[PDB]
Amino acid sequence: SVVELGKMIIQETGKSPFPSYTSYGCFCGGGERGPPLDATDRCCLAHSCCYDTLPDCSPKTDRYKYKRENGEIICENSTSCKKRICECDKAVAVCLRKNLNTYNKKYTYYPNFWCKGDIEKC
Amino acid sequence: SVVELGKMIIQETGKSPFPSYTSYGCFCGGGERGPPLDATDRCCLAHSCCYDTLPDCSPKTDRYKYKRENGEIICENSTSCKKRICECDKAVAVCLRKNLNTYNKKYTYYPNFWCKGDIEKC
Amino acid sequence: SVVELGKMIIQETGKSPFPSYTSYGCFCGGGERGPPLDATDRCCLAHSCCYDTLPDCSPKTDRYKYKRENGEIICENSTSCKKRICECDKAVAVCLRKNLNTYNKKYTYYPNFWCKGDIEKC
Amino acid sequence: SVVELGKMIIQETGKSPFPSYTSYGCFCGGGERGPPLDATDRCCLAHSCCYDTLPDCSPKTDRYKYKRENGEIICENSTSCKKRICECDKAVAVCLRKNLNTYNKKYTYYPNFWCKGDIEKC
Amino acid sequence: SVVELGKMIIQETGKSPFPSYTSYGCFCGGGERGPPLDATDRCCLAHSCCYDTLPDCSPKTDRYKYKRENGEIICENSTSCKKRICECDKAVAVCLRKNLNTYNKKYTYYPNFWCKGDIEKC
Amino acid sequence: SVVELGKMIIQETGKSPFPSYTSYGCFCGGGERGPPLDATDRCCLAHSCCYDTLPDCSPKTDRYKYKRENGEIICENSTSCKKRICECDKAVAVCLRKNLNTYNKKYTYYPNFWCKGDIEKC
Amino acid sequence: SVVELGKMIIQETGKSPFPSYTSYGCFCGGGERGPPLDATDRCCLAHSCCYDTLPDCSPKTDRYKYKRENGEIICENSTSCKKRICECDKAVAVCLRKNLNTYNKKYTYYPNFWCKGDIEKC
Amino acid sequence: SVVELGKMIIQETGKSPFPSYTSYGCFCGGGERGPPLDATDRCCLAHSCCYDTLPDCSPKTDRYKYKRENGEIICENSTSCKKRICECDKAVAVCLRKNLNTYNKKYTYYPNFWCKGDIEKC
């Protein structure tokens, strides 16, 4: 999925996952302590929470297929995980895009240890 | 603490002290002679005045901790100075955030002949 | 003169006073306390000093004329002030051009805690 | 000719003649008093002198044609005037392009009353 | 009094009269034909109409003095023309500032022959 | 007309054809293969389609006149083409304006592998 | 290899594929129609031709490994395709580097009517 | 020592260690595999090597002080470690400033897993 997630993101945002979103805020690129800095950071917390609903999968290595149809990303259905994993990544990509309006260049590289809130729950 | 103030600013105003505020107007990042240029500048003058009520502390260097509850910055209490230095910084970060609407980038490189009035009283 | 000087700057350095020099370091555009930041800043300190040798003139507001011959500035001499003022300006523009090799853009918005030392003597 | 010359210019430099060259330096867009500020301002003086040798014609207005064979300007031979005005324009567009490495954005808008030099000899 | 107007303008807008306003739109820096390109342009048409209520004087030349005061330009009252002229100038400067939020960088240099509208009536 | 269109674009969108629209999407400033990128791009496709209904005209070179009521563009009549070509341009110019809210500066330098869809059918 | 190629571009040129090359001229990032704008573009054309001698492969997607030894790129050999694809990439990366001396940023957003010539011969 | 080194950095280069050098090239912020990407990157390697000559100390953590006289860093000698460490930090700070002429913003964030060279031997 790392490959698929990356593709979806440059595609939906115009920004290369690395470094625009790999360490943005408190949750983009991983993280469990916030609170979130902004909406973009929220998209990331949601994404993680999403992956957490797929313990029977390997969201990072699971390769899958997806197509575009009238602007929307269409997830394949060959297998359960591929579909669900794709849906997680599809959602975060669309969310990042819908939130590009408040994307903050200076939040792109945010020191993880600055996030000291309690561990998020989902 | 100058370090903690920097976080508050980054997190609150959404800008990084350097270069957004280290040279803003007659008082941001330093300065004693006015008159202040705008609301933002005045935030810094007030900040400067707040520090003058802590002659028994070292606001620039005394390191302190803070937390974020309900989106609000909550100052620690291990020592009165840390508490007091922290409250000064919180106010300036919030005052800067409140006045982003009149933030003028040019005051970040103002004419060198501008801050030549007489020292402001607190 | 302030007008004639700017055009000198413009023709000699290729840069417009604003925002290239009106706020450079501790002395360009104004300032009494250093220490100067670099060769460029020192050109302006020397310019400040040069002006101080003309208490019988109005360096900043007494207009004058000058020509260019063989690519060099040639000051007029209708009045003595006009001549001496013009010489001061010609000198700074030449020093500015000459030091373009160390022109630092960041000194255009240096930290507000710099330039707070002794007043330089001419 | 305003058109052909116009065409050649953006084609060679990539800058829209107006407002990029119509008032650059002392000689772009017209001017007899210098001295030139840089190489670009000199391409425009060379241009003017090339038109000065067409009392044979109306170089500013006369219309003509030219081709782009192997990335270059080839003038037509329809009539002497047409052919000789095209060579004036071809020469200045190439000249300007060749000197783009010293084109100064702050010379783009240069007031001609700053050009005190005596009328330029060819 | 092109001096007073010039000063008022950088002071109020941060922009050098030349070249940021000397040829902006259809009316900045002269013009009887619009329509105005925008708010900024409308400030200028206003200014020139103001000057038209002064056949009584010579707006572009009668020198005068003003006081900045508490952020509000304050005109002098030695002569009528100096007061009337100064008021027309102040108004255009405050108008430009107030409309900096729509100042268009590519309207800065706008060819006058593109303004075909009828002769503007005040 | 290409000139007349450009003026229309500057007046209506507040953006200069170059580099704002000369390279936008798969159709602005040229292109036949889609699929169009966004609303701005479809304006151009439509525009290009509008030109196909004028096979007996030379829309790119045929010069025409037009006025401006208050803000509306009014096309001349001298000939059938000038009116028809002009209406085509007024159309795009107005379309480009109405869709500024989704104008994507990145589509100005979009991926070189993006316009391989099928030749669009008007 | 698109991923490996990009990393070679970053390494060899110091520019990221986006947006420095993904839309450069008629061939970088894609395109089959010239004429090629310059040397840099021509590197891409040669690359495209290089990719064509690999119909038995999936140059764009077959991932490979490589090392940097004494300043040089050293391709892998696990399979023939991986070796050949890598050699194609290495040569363009180096080629792109070798021509940084004529890199033109405007070719990053060239006119949309600029690459509709003949399909180039390999 | 993260304080001393951090301070030396901004002071010498004007760039905030984080995020401008905390992950630059293959060696900034730590790392043992290259090869180095450029001049800047080598400074860090040389810095890592310097620390390696101090196994009897704790260079990354050990605190110490320094002074700035006439623009140079002056290390203290309270203990040997503090002196040796400080000279390491100073060296890298100077090295960085000295090579800002090639600082590449595309290298500010370089994926460390892209550095596959053999473990550097100082």
Spell out the domain ranges in chain H: 1-122
Q: Name which of A104, A106, A117 is nearest B68 (Cβ-Cβ).
A: A117
CA torsion sign, G103 to G109 to G114 to G116? Answer: positive
CA torsion sign, A18 to A23 to A25 to A27? Answer: positive
Question: Residue D89 contacts by C-beta under 8 Å, 6 or more apart in sequence?
Answer: D1, D4, D5, D8, D47
Contact flag B11-A37 (C-beta cutoff 8 Å) = yes
Alpha helical stretches, state H, chain H? 2-13, 17-20, 39-52, 80-98
| B39: nearest Cα among B109, B95, B117 | B95
Contact flag G10-H106 (C-beta cutoff 8 Å) = yes
Q: Is B41 an annotated catalytic residue?
A: no
Type and span of the H or E element at B47: helix B39-51
Q: In angstroms, rounded to a whole number, what is the distance separating the alpha carbons of residues C15 and C30?
A: 18
- In three-state secondary structure terms, H2 is helix
Instruction: State the Rg of chain E over Cα.
Output: 14
| C37: nearest Cα among C91, C121, C111 | C111
Q: In angstroms, rounded to a whole number, what is the distance separating the alpha carbons of residues D35 and D24?
A: 13
Type and span of the H or E element at G74: strand G72-75
Phi, psi of A74 (to 5 degrees): -110, 115
The terminus-to-terminus CA distance of chain E in angstroms comes to 22
CA–chain centroid gap for F75, Å, is 16
In the DSSP assignment, the letter for residue C78 is S
Phi, psi of D20 (to 5 degrees): -70, -30
Among the listed residues C38, C41, C62, C89, the single catalytic one is: C89
CA–chain centroid gap for F2, Å, is 9
Q: Point out the residues of H that are catalytic.
A: 47, 89
Phi, psi of A67 (to 5 degrees): -130, 170
Amino acid at F9: I
Q: Nearest residue on chain E to D110, judged by CA atoms?
A: E19
Tell me if there are at least 3 CB pairs under 8 Å linking chains H and F: no
Type and span of the H or E element at E66: strand E66-67
Other C-beta atoms closer than 10 Å to the C-beta of H51 total 20
The angle subtended at Cα F46 by Cα F45 and Cα F49, nearest 5°, is 90
Phi, psi of G67 (to 5 degrees): -130, 170
How was this structure determined? It was done by X-ray
> Can you read off the two tokens belonging to residue E35?
């329509």
CA torsion sign, G92 to G94 to G97 to G99? Answer: negative
Q: In angstroms, rounded to a whole number, what is the distance separating the alpha carbons of residues G41 and G35?
A: 9
In three-state form (DSSP H/G/I as H, E/B as E, the rest C), the secondary structure along chain D is CHHHHHHHHHHHHCCCHHHHCCCCCCCCCCCCECCCCCHHHHHHHHHHHHHCCCCCCCCCCCCCCEECCCCCCEECCCCHHHHHHHHHHHHHHHHHHHCHHHCCCCCCCCCHHHCCCCECCC
| A10: nearest Cα among A19, G9, A1 | A19
DSSP E12-44: HHSS-HHHHTTT-TTTTTS-SB---SSHHHHHH
Q: In angstroms, rounded to a whole number, what is the distance separating the alpha carbons of residues E100 and E98?
A: 6
Looking at domain A1-122, its CATH class is mainly alpha
Resolution in A: 2.3
Q: In angstroms, rounded to a whole number, what is the distance separating the alpha carbons of residues D27 and D110?
A: 10
Q: In angstroms, rounded to a whole number, what is the distance separating the alpha carbons of residues E63 and E67?
A: 14
| H14: nearest Cα among H103, H111, H107, H109 | H103
8 A C-beta contact, residue B93 and residue B40: no
In the DSSP assignment, the letter for residue C106 is G
Please return the burial class of C69, using the count of CB atoms within 10 Å of its CB with bins 0-12, 13-18 and 19+.
Answer: exposed
Beta-sheet strands, E only, within C1-122: 66-69, 72-75
CA torsion sign, C51 to C55 to C60 to C64? Answer: negative
| G112: nearest Cα among D97, F33, A10 | F33
Q: In angstroms, rounded to a whole number, what is the distance separating the alpha carbons of residues E89 and E59?
A: 9
A→G contacts (Cβ < 8 Å), by residue, are: 10, 16
CA distances from residue C96 to C15, C40, C87, C111, F87 in whole angstroms, order as listed? 10, 6, 14, 22, 55
> Can you read off the two tokens belonging to residue A45?
């917390």
> Can you read off the two tokens belonging to residue G73?
């790129």
CA distances from residue A79 to A1, A61, A65 in whole angstroms, order as listed? 14, 14, 11
Tell me if there are at least 3 CB pairs under 8 Å linking chains G and F: yes
Q: In angstroms, rounded to a whole number, what is the distance separating the alpha carbons of residues B121 and C5?
A: 37
8 A C-beta contact, residue B68 and residue B9: no
CA dihedral of residues C77, C81, C87, C92 (deg, nearest 10): -150
Choose from E26, E106, E110, E112 for mutation: most chain F CBs within 10 A. E106
Provide the number of CB pairs (under 8 Å) joining chain B to chain H: 3
E→C contacts (Cβ < 8 Å), by residue, are: 10, 16
Q: Is A47 an annotated catalytic residue?
A: yes
8 A C-beta contact, residue E90 and residue E66: yes
- Burial code of F91-107, b = ≥16 C-beta within 10 A, e = fewer? bbbbbbbebeeebeeeb
| Percent composition of chain C: helix, strand, coil (DSSP 3-state, to 5) | 45, 10, 45
CA–chain centroid gap for E105, Å, is 18
> Can you read off the two tokens belonging to residue H119?
């473990």
Q: In angstroms, rounded to a whole number, what is the distance separating the alpha carbons of residues C32 and C119?
A: 6
The terminus-to-terminus CA distance of chain C in angstroms comes to 21
CA–chain centroid gap for E31, Å, is 12
- In three-state secondary structure terms, C73 is strand
Question: Residue D15 contacts by C-beta under 8 Å, 6 or more apart in sequence?
Answer: D9, D21, D103
Q: Nearest residue on chain A to H107, judged by CA atoms?
A: A19
Residues of F whose CB is below 8 A from E24: none
- In three-state secondary structure terms, G49 is helix
> Can you read off the two tokens belonging to residue B28?
């941001």
Which residue in the block uniquely carries the two structure tokens 């030749």? F119
Contact flag G109-F30 (C-beta cutoff 8 Å) = no
Q: In angstroms, rounded to a whole number, what is the distance separating the alpha carbons of residues B122 and B50?
A: 8
Q: In angstroms, rounded to a whole number, what is the distance separating the alpha carbons of residues A11 and A9?
A: 5
CA dihedral of residues H3, B15, C33, C48 (deg, nearest 10): 140
In the DSSP assignment, the letter for residue G118 is P
8 A C-beta contact, residue E102 and residue F53: no
Q: In angstroms, rounded to a whole number, what is the distance separating the alpha carbons of residues A28 and C117?
A: 45
**How do E66-67 and D74-75 pair as beta strands?**
unpaired
8 A C-beta contact, residue G112 and residue G31: no
Please return the burial class of A44, using the count of CB atoms within 10 Å of its CB with bins 0-12, 13-18 and 19+.
Answer: buried
Subunits with at least 3 CB pairs below 8 A relative to chain C? Answer: B, D, E
What pairs with residue E67 in β-bridges? Answer: E74
8 A C-beta contact, residue F17 and residue F24: no
Amino acid at D57: C
